[PDB]
């Protein structure tokens, strides 16, 4: 029962935003994985659908507690990938972006002493740093391996 | 294990897209429900928000058998709406456009005997009807009590 910043809200509504966008391409990128039998990959992306679905949920919740309404902006195209490695580098571009705009949206609502709005995106902040180093760290595995013999270690006995 | 009609898969990723998008609008409506203490709004639209996931999944599930790959349109802005007729109004929007695209789709596979996916679309156009039917109803009556009256007969004893 309290009425927020205005930007913080616009803050909140394009971070949701982005927490659906994120949710879409786990939604392909988890059944693409199914398909091709890879299980450690699609067991990673369900997790982390899950942290990105509570995150919106957060977003909503605050965006309601300060009497602002969900609204959100152009979603945008998905760029899905052709093969896991692309499939990989996407969703590291996603986040890389998501967690600049959470930054800036952090910065922004200590700065306007929303320290509420701030501590709920600093917790967020720190799941997406470690969907970030997930990311980085396949993805320095496919450039050492090769694509091929990355996917081949995949295969379970 | 086959390739299907490169004009199918296109449907089937355009229809794809549709699910999303009304999955992403469903999630946004059911915790400005909740909030709002609209419980009976709020469990129509969860359950329905069930549907529309496996009608995605069903999608993937046959674009991938088909040999394609999930590669989305544009999904657009989402118009959310400001109060509880705009939001079903934009529901209805939505479900009429993407019945619309099935009815073609359905027509299309059709033609080409490609018969499992339009078999599968024909499924998912009868669950669709359904929540046009219930989105159809609360509108009217809406317009029949007035959206105030409405909103105060949702109130639980
Ligand atoms: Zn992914
Ligand atoms: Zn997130
Ligand atoms: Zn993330
Ligand atoms: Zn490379
Ligand atoms: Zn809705
Ligand atoms: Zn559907
Ligand atoms: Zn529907
Ligand atoms: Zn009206």
Do not use: C
């Not at 949920?57 to 309404?69: A, P, W």
Request: charged share 30%; proline share 1%.
């Amino acid at each position: 029962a309290m009425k927020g910043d205005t930007k913080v809200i616009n803050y909140l509504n394009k971070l949701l935003g982005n927490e659906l966008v994120a949710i879409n391409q786990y939604f392909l990128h988890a059944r693409m994985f199914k398909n091709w039998g890879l299980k450690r990959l699609n067991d990673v992306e369900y997790r982390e659908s899950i942290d990105e679905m509570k995150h919106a949920d957060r977003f909503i919740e605050r965006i309601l507690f300060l009497e602002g309404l969900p609204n959100l902006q152009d979603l945008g195209k998905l760029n899905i990938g052709e093969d896991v490695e692309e499939m990989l580098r996407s969703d590291l571009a996603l986040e890389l972006d998501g967690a600049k705009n959470l930054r800036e949206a952090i910065g922004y609502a200590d700065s306007v002493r929303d320290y509420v709005s701030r501590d709920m995106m600093i917790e967020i902040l720190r799941d997406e740093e470690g969907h970030i180093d997930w990311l980085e760290t396949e993805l320095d595995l496919i450039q050492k391996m090769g694509l091929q013999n990355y996917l081949q270690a995949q295969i379970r006995e």
